[PDB]
Protein backbone atom coordinates (compact mmCIF):
# COMPACT_ATOMS: atom_id res chain seq x y z
CA UNK A 1 0.00 0.00 0.00
CA UNK A 2 3.00 2.22 0.57
CA UNK A 3 3.88 1.63 -3.08
CA UNK A 4 0.22 2.03 -4.09
CA UNK A 5 0.50 5.49 -2.50
CA UNK A 6 3.95 6.29 -3.88
CA UNK A 7 2.71 7.75 -7.18
CA UNK A 8 -0.06 9.82 -5.58
CA UNK A 9 1.88 13.12 -5.16
CA UNK A 10 3.09 12.89 -8.77
CA UNK A 11 -0.42 12.10 -10.08
CA UNK A 12 -1.82 14.89 -7.91
CA UNK A 13 0.54 17.43 -9.50
CA UNK A 14 -0.48 16.30 -13.01
CA UNK A 15 -4.12 16.55 -11.92
CA UNK A 16 -3.54 20.14 -10.73
CA UNK A 17 -1.95 20.92 -14.10
CA UNK A 18 -4.82 19.26 -15.94
CA UNK A 19 -7.33 21.43 -14.09
CA UNK A 20 -5.98 24.64 -15.65
CA UNK A 21 -7.61 23.34 -18.88
CA UNK A 22 -11.00 24.44 -17.50
CA UNK A 23 -9.85 28.05 -17.24
CA UNK A 24 -7.92 28.02 -20.53
CA UNK A 25 -11.07 26.69 -22.27
CA UNK A 26 -13.10 29.58 -20.79
CA UNK A 27 -10.59 32.12 -22.09
CA UNK A 28 -10.60 30.57 -25.56
CA UNK A 29 -14.40 30.50 -25.49
CA UNK A 30 -14.38 34.26 -24.77
CA UNK A 31 -11.70 35.20 -27.32
CA UNK A 32 -12.21 32.60 -30.05
CA UNK A 33 -8.54 31.62 -29.98
CA UNK A 34 -7.88 28.04 -31.15
CA UNK A 35 -7.02 25.25 -28.72
CA UNK A 36 -3.88 24.26 -30.61
CA UNK A 37 -0.90 26.64 -30.89
CA UNK A 38 2.10 24.85 -32.37
CA UNK A 39 4.66 27.51 -31.49
CA UNK A 40 3.59 27.95 -27.87
CA UNK A 41 3.32 24.18 -27.32
CA UNK A 42 6.82 23.65 -28.68
CA UNK A 43 8.26 26.25 -26.29
CA UNK A 44 6.41 24.61 -23.38
CA UNK A 45 7.99 21.28 -24.23
CA UNK A 46 11.45 22.76 -24.90
CA UNK A 47 11.38 24.55 -21.52
CA UNK A 48 10.73 21.17 -19.87
CA UNK A 49 13.69 19.73 -21.74
CA UNK A 50 15.97 22.56 -20.56
CA UNK A 51 15.04 22.11 -16.89
CA UNK A 52 15.13 18.29 -16.93
CA UNK A 53 18.73 17.87 -15.75
CA UNK A 54 18.08 19.94 -12.62
CA UNK A 55 15.95 16.97 -11.39
CA UNK A 56 18.01 14.01 -12.66
CA UNK A 57 15.73 13.60 -15.69
CA UNK A 58 16.90 12.96 -19.23
CA UNK A 59 15.79 15.44 -21.85
CA UNK A 60 13.86 12.74 -23.70
CA UNK A 61 12.00 11.75 -20.52
CA UNK A 62 10.85 15.30 -19.74
CA UNK A 63 9.79 15.83 -23.36
CA UNK A 64 7.63 12.70 -23.31
CA UNK A 65 6.09 13.62 -19.95
CA UNK A 66 5.25 17.18 -20.90
CA UNK A 67 4.06 16.27 -24.40
CA UNK A 68 1.70 13.97 -22.52
CA UNK A 69 0.70 16.87 -20.24
CA UNK A 70 -0.12 19.21 -23.09
CA UNK A 71 -2.13 16.56 -24.99
CA UNK A 72 -4.18 15.72 -21.90
CA UNK A 73 -4.83 19.44 -21.42
CA UNK A 74 -6.02 19.82 -25.02
CA UNK A 75 -8.23 16.71 -24.59
CA UNK A 76 -10.12 18.53 -21.84
CA UNK A 77 -10.20 21.85 -23.70
CA UNK A 78 -11.60 20.41 -26.94
CA UNK A 79 -14.29 18.44 -25.07
CA UNK A 80 -15.37 21.35 -22.88
CA UNK A 81 -15.53 23.78 -25.79
CA UNK A 82 -17.70 21.44 -27.83
CA UNK A 83 -19.86 20.68 -24.80
CA UNK A 84 -20.44 24.42 -24.44
CA UNK A 85 -20.95 24.85 -28.19
CA UNK A 86 -23.75 22.25 -28.09
CA UNK A 87 -25.51 24.06 -25.21
CA UNK A 88 -24.95 27.59 -26.51
CA UNK A 89 -23.12 28.95 -23.46
CA UNK A 90 -20.15 28.30 -21.16
CA UNK A 91 -20.25 28.39 -17.34
CA UNK A 92 -20.24 31.82 -15.68
CA UNK A 93 -17.12 30.94 -13.65
CA UNK A 94 -14.94 34.04 -13.12
CA UNK A 95 -12.01 34.07 -15.53
CA UNK A 96 -8.46 33.96 -14.19
CA UNK A 97 -5.81 35.93 -16.11
CA UNK A 98 -3.89 33.56 -18.40
CA UNK A 99 -0.61 35.47 -18.05
CA UNK A 100 -1.14 36.68 -14.48
CA UNK A 101 -2.63 33.60 -12.83
CA UNK A 102 -2.54 30.50 -15.04
CA UNK A 103 1.04 30.91 -16.31
CA UNK A 104 2.62 31.07 -12.81
CA UNK A 105 0.56 28.01 -11.80
CA UNK A 106 1.87 26.07 -14.81
CA UNK A 107 5.44 27.21 -14.05
CA UNK A 108 5.31 26.04 -10.43
CA UNK A 109 3.78 22.73 -11.53
CA UNK A 110 6.54 22.11 -14.06
CA UNK A 111 8.94 22.08 -11.14
CA UNK A 112 6.64 20.12 -8.82
CA UNK A 113 5.96 17.47 -11.48
CA UNK A 114 9.69 17.10 -12.13
CA UNK A 115 10.44 17.05 -8.40
CA UNK A 116 7.82 14.32 -7.94
CA UNK A 117 9.13 12.35 -10.94
CA UNK A 118 12.58 12.38 -9.39
CA UNK A 119 11.18 11.33 -6.01
CA UNK A 120 9.43 8.29 -7.51
CA UNK A 121 12.27 7.38 -9.95
CA UNK A 122 12.92 3.99 -8.28
CA UNK A 123 9.40 2.65 -8.89
CA UNK A 124 9.07 3.79 -12.51
CA UNK A 125 10.52 0.53 -13.88
CA UNK A 126 8.92 -1.76 -11.27
CA UNK A 127 6.86 -4.66 -12.60
CA UNK A 128 3.49 -3.48 -11.28
CA UNK A 129 4.08 0.15 -12.24
CA UNK A 130 1.05 0.26 -14.56
CA UNK A 131 -1.31 -1.06 -11.87
CA UNK A 132 0.05 1.35 -9.25
CA UNK A 133 -0.26 4.40 -11.52
CA UNK A 134 -3.80 3.39 -12.53
CA UNK A 135 -4.69 3.03 -8.84
CA UNK A 136 -3.14 6.43 -8.04
CA UNK A 137 -5.26 8.01 -10.77
CA UNK A 138 -8.29 6.37 -9.22
CA UNK A 139 -7.43 7.66 -5.75
CA UNK A 140 -6.73 11.20 -6.97
CA UNK A 141 -9.92 11.27 -9.02
CA UNK A 142 -11.91 10.17 -5.96
CA UNK A 143 -10.12 12.68 -3.67
CA UNK A 144 -10.58 15.53 -6.13
CA UNK A 145 -14.08 14.49 -7.31
CA UNK A 146 -12.84 14.59 -10.93
CA UNK A 147 -15.55 13.72 -13.45
CA UNK A 148 -15.24 11.10 -16.20
CA UNK A 149 -13.73 13.53 -18.73
CA UNK A 150 -11.02 14.70 -16.33
CA UNK A 151 -10.19 11.18 -15.15
CA UNK A 152 -9.90 10.02 -18.76
CA UNK A 153 -7.50 12.88 -19.47
CA UNK A 154 -5.62 12.20 -16.23
CA UNK A 155 -5.09 8.66 -17.61
CA UNK A 156 -3.68 10.34 -20.74
CA UNK A 157 -1.36 12.55 -18.69
CA UNK A 158 0.22 9.69 -16.67
CA UNK A 159 0.83 7.69 -19.87
CA UNK A 160 4.62 7.49 -19.61
CA UNK A 161 5.36 7.64 -15.90
CA UNK A 162 6.03 3.91 -16.17
CA UNK A 163 9.06 3.04 -18.29
CA UNK A 164 10.19 -0.46 -19.27
CA UNK B 1 -29.17 18.52 -42.66
CA UNK B 2 -25.85 19.11 -40.91
CA UNK B 3 -23.34 18.71 -43.75
CA UNK B 4 -20.60 17.49 -41.39
CA UNK B 5 -22.47 14.38 -40.13
CA UNK B 6 -21.09 11.92 -42.75
CA UNK B 7 -17.50 13.06 -42.02
CA UNK B 8 -17.98 12.83 -38.25
CA UNK B 9 -19.55 9.37 -38.66
CA UNK B 10 -16.46 8.13 -40.52
CA UNK B 11 -14.27 9.60 -37.76
CA UNK B 12 -16.41 7.85 -35.15
CA UNK B 13 -16.03 4.57 -37.03
CA UNK B 14 -12.26 4.97 -36.93
CA UNK B 15 -12.28 6.08 -33.30
CA UNK B 16 -14.26 3.05 -32.20
CA UNK B 17 -11.51 0.68 -33.36
CA UNK B 18 -9.73 1.86 -30.20
CA UNK B 19 -11.77 -0.57 -28.11
CA UNK B 20 -10.32 -3.54 -30.01
CA UNK B 21 -6.77 -2.15 -30.19
CA UNK B 22 -6.84 -1.55 -26.44
CA UNK B 23 -7.83 -5.19 -25.89
CA UNK B 24 -4.90 -6.29 -28.05
CA UNK B 25 -2.47 -4.21 -26.01
CA UNK B 26 -3.95 -5.53 -22.77
CA UNK B 27 -3.14 -9.05 -24.02
CA UNK B 28 0.33 -8.33 -25.43
CA UNK B 29 1.61 -5.64 -23.06
CA UNK B 30 2.72 -3.49 -25.97
CA UNK B 31 2.52 0.27 -25.20
CA UNK B 32 -0.26 2.44 -26.51
CA UNK B 33 2.30 4.72 -28.13
CA UNK B 34 4.40 3.25 -30.93
CA UNK B 35 6.40 6.11 -32.41
CA UNK B 36 7.37 4.50 -35.70
CA UNK B 37 3.95 2.89 -36.19
CA UNK B 38 2.21 6.23 -35.64
CA UNK B 39 4.64 8.04 -37.94
CA UNK B 40 3.79 5.50 -40.67
CA UNK B 41 0.02 5.98 -40.23
CA UNK B 42 0.53 9.71 -40.67
CA UNK B 43 2.85 9.21 -43.67
CA UNK B 44 0.24 6.96 -45.28
CA UNK B 45 -2.29 9.78 -45.03
CA UNK B 46 0.18 12.26 -46.52
CA UNK B 47 0.73 9.83 -49.40
CA UNK B 48 -2.98 9.67 -50.19
CA UNK B 49 -3.82 13.37 -49.53
CA UNK B 50 -3.65 14.59 -53.14
CA UNK B 51 -5.95 11.81 -54.39
CA UNK B 52 -8.71 13.61 -52.43
CA UNK B 53 -7.51 17.12 -53.31
CA UNK B 54 -6.12 17.64 -49.80
CA UNK B 55 -2.83 19.30 -48.99
CA UNK B 56 -0.29 17.06 -47.30
CA UNK B 57 -0.30 19.38 -44.29
CA UNK B 58 -4.09 19.18 -43.95
CA UNK B 59 -4.07 15.38 -44.20
CA UNK B 60 -1.24 15.24 -41.67
CA UNK B 61 -3.15 17.42 -39.19
CA UNK B 62 -6.43 15.51 -39.56
CA UNK B 63 -4.80 12.11 -39.08
CA UNK B 64 -2.57 13.36 -36.29
CA UNK B 65 -5.86 14.27 -34.61
CA UNK B 66 -7.30 10.84 -35.42
CA UNK B 67 -4.36 9.00 -33.83
CA UNK B 68 -4.36 11.22 -30.75
CA UNK B 69 -8.10 10.64 -30.25
CA UNK B 70 -7.59 6.88 -30.58
CA UNK B 71 -4.80 6.88 -27.98
CA UNK B 72 -6.99 8.91 -25.61
CA UNK B 73 -9.60 6.15 -25.66
CA UNK B 74 -6.99 3.38 -25.36
CA UNK B 75 -5.25 4.94 -22.33
CA UNK B 76 -8.49 5.45 -20.42
CA UNK B 77 -9.84 1.96 -21.24
CA UNK B 78 -6.60 0.28 -20.18
CA UNK B 79 -6.52 2.12 -16.88
CA UNK B 80 -10.23 1.49 -16.29
CA UNK B 81 -9.55 -2.22 -16.80
CA UNK B 82 -6.55 -2.15 -14.47
CA UNK B 83 -8.59 -0.39 -11.77
CA UNK B 84 -11.43 -2.90 -12.25
CA UNK B 85 -8.89 -5.74 -12.33
CA UNK B 86 -9.62 -7.29 -15.74
CA UNK B 87 -10.42 -6.48 -19.35
CA UNK B 88 -13.77 -7.33 -21.00
CA UNK B 89 -14.13 -10.92 -22.20
CA UNK B 90 -14.90 -9.64 -25.72
CA UNK B 91 -13.45 -11.69 -28.60
CA UNK B 92 -10.38 -10.09 -30.14
CA UNK B 93 -10.46 -9.41 -33.88
CA UNK B 94 -7.11 -9.92 -35.59
CA UNK B 95 -5.01 -6.88 -36.43
CA UNK B 96 -4.00 -8.21 -39.86
CA UNK B 97 -7.39 -9.65 -40.80
CA UNK B 98 -9.77 -7.00 -39.46
CA UNK B 99 -8.36 -3.92 -37.70
CA UNK B 100 -5.70 -2.80 -40.19
CA UNK B 101 -7.94 -3.30 -43.29
CA UNK B 102 -10.80 -1.41 -41.57
CA UNK B 103 -8.47 1.46 -40.74
CA UNK B 104 -7.19 1.46 -44.33
CA UNK B 105 -10.71 1.69 -45.75
CA UNK B 106 -11.67 4.40 -43.21
CA UNK B 107 -8.70 6.55 -44.23
CA UNK B 108 -10.24 6.72 -47.71
CA UNK B 109 -13.75 7.26 -46.27
CA UNK B 110 -12.59 10.14 -44.07
CA UNK B 111 -10.68 11.75 -46.93
CA UNK B 112 -13.57 11.40 -49.37
CA UNK B 113 -15.92 13.01 -46.84
CA UNK B 114 -13.42 15.82 -46.19
CA UNK B 115 -13.15 16.50 -49.90
CA UNK B 116 -16.94 16.65 -50.35
CA UNK B 117 -17.30 19.36 -47.68
CA UNK B 118 -14.14 21.32 -48.62
CA UNK B 119 -16.05 24.57 -49.38
CA UNK B 120 -17.74 24.46 -45.97
CA UNK B 121 -14.66 23.97 -43.78
CA UNK B 122 -13.98 27.70 -43.68
CA UNK B 123 -17.52 29.07 -43.18
CA UNK B 124 -18.25 30.97 -39.98
CA UNK B 125 -20.69 28.45 -38.53
CA UNK B 126 -18.35 25.48 -39.07
CA UNK B 127 -17.54 25.00 -35.36
CA UNK B 128 -21.22 24.91 -34.36
CA UNK B 129 -22.10 22.50 -37.18
CA UNK B 130 -19.29 20.12 -36.27
CA UNK B 131 -20.15 20.22 -32.55
CA UNK B 132 -23.80 19.42 -33.27
CA UNK B 133 -22.66 16.63 -35.59
CA UNK B 134 -20.56 15.10 -32.78
CA UNK B 135 -23.56 15.08 -30.44
CA UNK B 136 -25.86 13.52 -33.00
CA UNK B 137 -23.36 10.77 -33.89
CA UNK B 138 -22.63 10.03 -30.23
CA UNK B 139 -26.31 9.54 -29.38
CA UNK B 140 -27.01 7.42 -32.48
CA UNK B 141 -23.98 5.12 -31.92
CA UNK B 142 -24.18 4.87 -28.10
CA UNK B 143 -20.89 6.63 -27.37
CA UNK B 144 -20.33 7.20 -23.66
CA UNK B 145 -18.62 10.28 -22.18
CA UNK B 146 -15.15 8.89 -22.92
CA UNK B 147 -15.93 8.15 -26.57
CA UNK B 148 -17.70 11.47 -27.19
CA UNK B 149 -14.81 13.44 -25.63
CA UNK B 150 -12.33 11.71 -27.91
CA UNK B 151 -14.62 12.27 -30.88
CA UNK B 152 -14.47 15.98 -30.01
CA UNK B 153 -10.67 15.53 -30.13
CA UNK B 154 -10.82 13.81 -33.56
CA UNK B 155 -12.89 16.59 -35.23
CA UNK B 156 -10.53 19.27 -33.87
CA UNK B 157 -9.29 20.65 -37.18
CA UNK B 158 -12.12 20.07 -39.59
CA UNK B 159 -12.82 23.79 -39.35
CA UNK B 160 -9.96 25.86 -40.77
CA UNK B 161 -9.94 29.68 -40.71
Automatic annotation (TrEMBL), chain B:
<protein>
    <recommendedName>
        <fullName>chorismate mutase</fullName>
        <ecNumber>5.4.99.5</ecNumber>
    </recommendedName>
</protein>
<dbReference type="GO" id="GO:0009697">
    <property type="term" value="P:salicylic acid biosynthetic process"/>
</dbReference>
<feature type="disulfide bond">
    <location>
        <begin position="126"/>
        <end position="159"/>
    </location>
</feature>
<dbReference type="InterPro" id="IPR008240">
    <property type="entry name" value="Chorismate_mutase_periplasmic"/>
</dbReference>
<dbReference type="GO" id="GO:0004106">
    <property type="term" value="F:chorismate mutase activity"/>
</dbReference>
<keyword id="KW-0732">Signal</keyword>
<keyword id="KW-0413">Isomerase</keyword>
<dbReference type="InterPro" id="IPR036979">
    <property type="entry name" value="CM_dom_sf"/>
</dbReference>
<dbReference type="InterPro" id="IPR002701">
    <property type="entry name" value="CM_II_prokaryot"/>
</dbReference>
<feature type="domain" description="Chorismate mutase">
    <location>
        <begin position="1"/>
        <end position="78"/>
    </location>
</feature>
<dbReference type="GO" id="GO:0046417">
    <property type="term" value="P:chorismate metabolic process"/>
</dbReference>
<dbReference type="InterPro" id="IPR051331">
    <property type="entry name" value="Chorismate_mutase-related"/>
</dbReference>
<dbReference type="InterPro" id="IPR036263">
    <property type="entry name" value="Chorismate_II_sf"/>
</dbReference>
<comment type="pathway">
    <text>Metabolic intermediate biosynthesis; prephenate biosynthesis; prephenate from chorismate: step 1/1.</text>
</comment>
<keyword id="KW-0614">Plasmid</keyword>
<dbReference type="Pfam" id="PF01817">
    <property type="entry name" value="CM_2"/>
</dbReference>
Amino acid sequence: GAQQDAFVPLVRSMADRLNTADQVALSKWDTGQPVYDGQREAQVIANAATMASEYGLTAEDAINIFSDQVEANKEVQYALLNNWRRQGDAPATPRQSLAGVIRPILDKLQASIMQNLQSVAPLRSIADCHALVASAVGQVAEQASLDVLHRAALDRAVARICVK
